[PDB]
């Protein structure tokens, strides 16, 4: 069909070209025969027939009369559907301004003619006249004159001096000027005088008019001469129940427009005075503006309805306009939903589907199959058969359902695993049965949550569901390689109770041939589930060529682990089932199974795991009772000591000895200490409570108490909840946030009184509100993140860039918080690989660092690894497959075509739910491991005592062990004491150095991503060299820079009334701390560079997320950052046609000036620009996406005045237009077309 879409200003001729007739009446229907009154808003002559292929009069009534024009009613006979397509027009008596170009924030009409907005509005209201085409007179072609000036003005020159008032004047201003003339002069003006204002108005206006003229749209078209009307069936008057009618308020607005225009024409024909006709012109302007966009004016009230009326821009823009509610998202046929249930008997790749839902859903396929097999004469008979629900059709539904997958989705869709494909299993009832292992991926509780189902109709959809969206194909999370099918609660418990050892049970220490003997022993009740035993077991090892070998041995284990070994697939070692099998390890089991044996076994392994977990958790008989909760008798003794201390401190504070705040803080500290004491007492009482006897008097073990097992296994709970079921429960705060002066001394095992519950209610309300509102804020963040970076795909495999980033184990000034193996795994190297002394090249520049190579680097232990990144990619308008990496649910490299930016945004979005909108309340270096001191970037001096003291602020301290790696890094302040220096060796825990040391949880990410600066920013010097101070005290005390080999014309104006940190007689590098406080990322890029700012952003967001314990790979934030910096401002035009201060996207100027650099002509210099996500989202060429997102009005007006053409590359706009995505399967197809 068609290609790229164009948008521009509408010529009145073009408006009439769309239009077939002019509406001349405000009437809609005849009021008795609801036929349309010709010719009005609803008209058959202008628009079309009310009924299919019928004249309004009925003379040419037959259906054979196609294309004939009637002559008694002037109606053309066609389908009534064309009553929704055909347009009309209205000829305005007086010219009218288009409010979209008037009230756009950069007013198009106002900025075009170099005129302020207030003056234009004062002119449109007939408050003041305005000159046009004065020739040789006193005033220029544009000026403002009051009525008492216009009085004696025309008396000076009756001719050669034209001066009108109103919209006709603005149209004469737009038509009189031809922009070539006013551009040629702006050239010289902007050439000579510097005057930042001059260049700003220049760049804006000159770009406006040059891109303006390039298209061909004329300025006069900002003034509306003709007005196009919407087809009637788009704003219908369809009758409703009870004789009442329903209509869009558009009809009322068009009605007012027609009425007032006709009244203005009548007043013109009646020779009305100037006051009345000016009032009518203003009123007509008001009506037209209310029609176009209601809200920038008096906000016309409805008729008998107090709310305003929905205008056209109101139909388009907003979260409920045709963009958010229709084009991006739409209601779908062949779909349903219901409450969900468990269905544990299911294998992983299926779900329980009710009979009635599957019947109503697959109706067309049922009809087709029934009439294909001859069981139904025709399609009507098939519908009658299913409406009767005959017994034969159930087998036909069996046939059509077998190999036809269905799609399941939950309401809070965060990541792609929010939708998954399953195989239908017909189930009696009305509830959907969802496999339990997938619930973790869905975040779907069984607390009433409902899920929806969809049916893939076409063959391509079925194959995409089976090969991509299948539950079996998606086991590893995309955000991190961790599995998403991990057993959740009951199965984890079952396996924990199975695999475990008590000190004594039936048949401890006996011997068995293998696991089958263990099953025979247990099921007959002769041997206990947990008992220390030795059994012969056969484990398998792929060995020495890939050929499978097997070895048997006598292993020390328990009966439960022996029985469990039967499920373990061939290749795994027995060591994996010899531990206690916590949830954390029940995950690593499946992880290793997938890494070794592949997907095919791992699936059946997980199925059998869930089966046996549920079975043995049932068999165990686990429960929870009132006595299962421990209550240490020491509890009251600790309470008593605490309250004796509080009466002591009340004695001391009463007799004016300890101050108020100090005593309060001390009470807080002692209460926290007492809470910790009670917690430790109850935990030691409960954890190893079990005192038992085995061939001897007494021994003790890990307790078999129910709630303790539920806590330790990871099935349900953590330390805090168990602490609160048993011991005194912490301390809360008042609405101010001030912590209470008397912590709760009760547990839920006991009975709380009124005060304690009333105080806990505060925190309960705070936290529940945080959840309820933070979830919506997080969804908002997810939307911004998808919009900024979604148009990114794997366009080409490689680009050839050698740029990359250095990777080291992250250390924040303490111990390592994340190893280098987590940060480098799954990424392609960016350089040659050598040992510290260049022994030989271990790894090349393009080997994907998979597990083998990660381990090999672990052997050599070099920890400065240059790796390829997404931001450094040379690819234009896309990403190369090598620089991305390999990460996916699948373990191989990324495929040529997968849409990675959307996955990145979803990966960041899923942890957004786990965050919190409002936070809960809130001497020297001590080395942890043994190593060697390495002082880096430090000036040192030997003091009187001989201890090395530090005279620099940027001092860093590394711990180099005997291999050469760096595990400990710290930042040492200026003026510290070092008993050591650079070169010696220290012990573990040895104090190396000493010195005297002297509010939003989740939006801490949003403010960071938006590139928003801190409230009080720090400053960074511009260039390296020695610094000093200068001119005195007027708002700013100047900072003089000093470079080494040249002078510094640079001189910064830093306000003196803020404390500085830079040493007035010391050297400072470009980007060194001249003061303190948080910093703004744009300046961080502007000084340090690209890699520094992307490293800052990824590290900061990784800290914020890691605090809540969510694993996220750096790649997604890498691609977000690459899309953030996409824009850059030109600096020197050179031999290019760019503007000196123009902001263009990096890739475009890149390819252009790179071709000019391959040419002989000099290139153009640029400077990278940092745009926030909600701002870089606007810097998207194809405006359709920009209007789907950010405010639609101004976006359309800008792209329209520019005459911007749109070839619809990328995804979102293809989604709008409704054809194939250029990312997934379609990419191949699209790769066939874009090359064509």
């Amino acid at each position: 069909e068609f290609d790229a879409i164009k948008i521009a200003l509408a010529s009145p001729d073009m408006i009439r070209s769309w239009s077939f007739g002019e509406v001349k009446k405000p009437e809609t229907i005849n009021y008795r025969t609801f036929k349309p009154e010709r010719d009005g808003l609803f008209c058959a002559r202008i628009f079309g027939p009310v009924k299919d292929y019928e004249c309004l009069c009925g003379k040419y009534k037959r259906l054979k009369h196609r294309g004939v024009i009637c002559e008694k009613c002037g109606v053309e006979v066609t389908q009534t559907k064309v009553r929704r397509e055909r347009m009309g027009h209205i000829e305005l008596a007086s010219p009218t301004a288009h409010i979209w170009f008037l009230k756009s924030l950069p007013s198009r009409i106002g900025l075009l003619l170099d005129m302020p907005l207030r003056d234009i509005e004062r002119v449109l209201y007939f408050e003041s006249y305005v000159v046009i085409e004065g020739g040789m007179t006193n005033l220029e072609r544009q000026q403002i004159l009051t009525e008492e000036q216009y009085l004696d003005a025309l008396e000076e020159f009756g001719d050669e001096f034209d001066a009108k008032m109103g919209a006709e004047a603005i149209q004469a201003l737009l038509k009189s000027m031809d922009l070539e003339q006013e551009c040629e002069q702006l050239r010289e003006e902007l050439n000579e005088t510097n005057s930042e204002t001059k260049r700003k108005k220049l760049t804006k206006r000159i770009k406006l008019l040059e891109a303006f003229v390039q298209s061909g749209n004329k300025p006069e078209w900002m003034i509306l001469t003709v007005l196009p009307v919407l087809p009637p069936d788009l704003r219908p008057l369809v009758p409703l129940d009870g004789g009442r009618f329903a209509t869009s308020d558009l009809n009322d607005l068009y009605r007012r427009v027609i009425n007032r225009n006709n009244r203005l024409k009548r007043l013109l024909d009646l020779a009305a005075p100037d006051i009345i006709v000016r009032n009518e012109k203003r009123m007509l302007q008001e009506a037209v503006d209310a029609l176009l966009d209601n809200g920038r004016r008096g906000r016309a009230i409805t008729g008998s309805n107090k709310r305003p009326l929905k205008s056209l821009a109101d139909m388009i823009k907003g979260k409920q306009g045709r963009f958010r509610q229709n084009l991006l998202g739409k209601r779908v046929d062949y779909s349903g939903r219901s409450v969900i249930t468990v269905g544990p008997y299911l294998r992983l790749h299926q779900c329980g589907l009710p009979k009635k839902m599957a019947l109503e859903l697959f109706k067309p396929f049922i009809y087709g199959k029934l009439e294909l097999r001859g069981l139904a004469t025709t399609i009507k008979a098939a519908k009658k058969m299913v409406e009767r629900e005959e017994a034969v059709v159930w087998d036909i539904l069996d046939e059509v359902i077998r190999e036809h997958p269905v799609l399941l989705n939950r309401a809070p869709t965060l990541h792609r695993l929010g939708i998954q494909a399953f195989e239908p299993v017909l189930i009696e009832g009305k509830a959907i049965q969802l496999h339990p292992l997938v619930c973790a991926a869905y975040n779907a509780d069984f607390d009433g949550d409902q899920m929806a189902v969809h049916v893939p109709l076409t063959l391509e959809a079925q194959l995409e569901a089976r090969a991509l969206m299948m539950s079996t194909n998606n086991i590893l999370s995309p955000a991190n390689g961790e599995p998403i099918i991990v057993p959740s609660q009951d199965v984890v418990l079952g396996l924990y109770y199975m695999t475990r050892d008590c000190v004594n049970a039936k048949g401890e220490g006996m011997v068995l041939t293998g696991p089958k003997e263990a099953e025979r022993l247990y099921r007959s009740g002769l041997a206990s589930l947990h008992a220390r035993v030795k059994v012969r077991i056969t484990e398998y090892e792929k060995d020495a060529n890939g050929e499978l070998v097997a070895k048997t041995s006598l292993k020390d284990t328990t009966v439960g682990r022996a029985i469990l070994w039967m499920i373990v697939p061939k290749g795994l070692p027995y060591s994996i089932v010899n531990q206690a099998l916590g949830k954390k390890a029940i995950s690593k089991m499946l992880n290793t199974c997938y890494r070794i044996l592949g997907l095919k076994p791992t699936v059946i392994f997980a199925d059998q795991i869930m089966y046996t977990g549920f079975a043995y958790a049932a068999r165990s008989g686990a429960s929870v009772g009132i006595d299962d909760m421990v209550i240490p008798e020491k509890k009251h003794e600790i309470i008593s000591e605490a309250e004796a201390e509080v009466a002591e401190i009340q004695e001391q504070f009463q007799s004016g000895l300890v101050t108020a705040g100090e005593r309060y803080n001390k009470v807080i500290d002692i209460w926290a200490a007492a809470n910790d004491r009670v917690s430790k007492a109850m935990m030691d009482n409960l954890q190893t409570e079990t005192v038992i006897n085995r061939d001897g008097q007494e021994e003790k073990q890990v307790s078999f108490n129910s709630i303790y097992m539920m806590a330790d296994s990871g099935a349900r709970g953590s330390a805090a909840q168990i602490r609160q079921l048993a011991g005194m429960r912490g301390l809360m705060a008042k609405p101010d946030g001030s912590i209470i002066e008397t912590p709760i001394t009760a547990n839920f095992r006991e009975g709380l009184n009124v005060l304690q519950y009333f105080i806990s209610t505060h925190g309960a309300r705070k936290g529940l509100a945080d959840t309820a509102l933070k979830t919506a804020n997080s969804g908002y963040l997810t939307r911004r993140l998808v919009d900024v970076a979604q148009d990114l795909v794997v366009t080409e495999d490689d680009c050839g860039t050698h740029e990359g980033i250095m990777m080291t184990p992250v250390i924040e000034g303490g111990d390592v918080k994340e190893p280098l193996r987590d940060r480098v795994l799954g990424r392609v190297t960016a350089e040659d690989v050598l040992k510290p002394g260049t022994a030989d090249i271990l790894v090349p520049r393009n080997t994907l660092l998979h597990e083998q190579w990660c381990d090999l680097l672990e052997e050599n232990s070099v920890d400065a690894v240059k790796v390829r990144s997404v931001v450094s990619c040379d690819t234009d308008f896309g990403v190369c497959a090598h620089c991305y990496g390999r990460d996916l649910a699948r373990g191989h490299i990324i495929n040529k075509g997968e849409a990675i930016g959307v996955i990145a945004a979803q990966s960041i979005g899923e942890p957004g739910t786990q965050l919190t909108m409002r936070t809960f309340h809130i001497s020297s270096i001590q080395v942890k491991n043994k190593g060697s001191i390495k002082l880096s970037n430090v000036k040192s001096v030997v003091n009187s005592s001989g201890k090395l003291v530090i005279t620099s602020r940027n001092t860093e301290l590394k711990l180099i062990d005997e291999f050469g790696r760096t595990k400990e890094s710290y930042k040492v302040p200026y003026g510290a004491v070092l008993a050591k220096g650079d070169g010696e060796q220290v012990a573990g825990g040895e104090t190396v150095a000493n010195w005297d040391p002297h509010t939003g949880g989740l939006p801490r990410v949003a403010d960071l991503f938006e590139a928003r600066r801190p409230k009080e920013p720090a400053i960074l010097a511009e260039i390296s060299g020695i610094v000093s101070f200068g001119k005195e005290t007027k708002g700013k005390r100047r900072l003089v820079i000093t470079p080494v080999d040249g002078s510094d014309p640079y001189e910064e104006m830093i306000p003196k009334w803020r404390q500085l940190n830079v040493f007035e007689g010391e050297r400072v590098e470009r980007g060194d701390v001249i003061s303190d406080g948080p910093e703004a990322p744009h300046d961080i890029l502007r000084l340090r560079g690209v890699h520094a700012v992307t490293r800052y952003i990824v590290n900061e967001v990784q800290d914020v997320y890691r605090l809540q314990g969510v694993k996220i790979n750096d790649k997604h934030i890498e691609v977000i950052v690459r899309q953030m910096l996409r824009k850059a401002t030109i600096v020197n035009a050179g031999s290019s046609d760019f503007l000196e201060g123009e902001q263009v996207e990096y890739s475009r100027v890149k390819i252009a000036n790179r071709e000019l650099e391959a040419n002989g002509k000099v290139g153009a210099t640029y400077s990278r620009d940092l745009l926030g996500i909600t701002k870089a989202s606007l810097a998207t060429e194809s405006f359709i996406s920009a209007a789907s997102f950010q405010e639609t009005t101004r976006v359309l007006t800008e792209a329209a005045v520019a005459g911007k053409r749109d070839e619809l590359r990328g995804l979102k706009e293809n989604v709008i237009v409704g054809r194939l995505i250029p990312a997934g399967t379609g990419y191949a197809y699209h790769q066939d077309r874009m090359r064509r």
Binding site: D445, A672, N675, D676, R716, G717, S718, A719, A720, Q721, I722, Q724, R729, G730, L731, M732, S760, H762, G763, A764, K766, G767, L768, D770, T771, Q914, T916, T919, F920, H921, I922, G1001, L1107, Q1108, G1109
Partner: peptide, 21 residues
């Protein structure tokens, strides 16, 4: 405590924060 569906208002300062069911 854990299994994040509602936050734990009651804790010693510095703990990450639950995120409790």
């Amino acid at each position: 405590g854990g299994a994040g569906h509602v936050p734990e208002y009651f804790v010693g300062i510095g703990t990450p924060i639950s995120f409790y069911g």
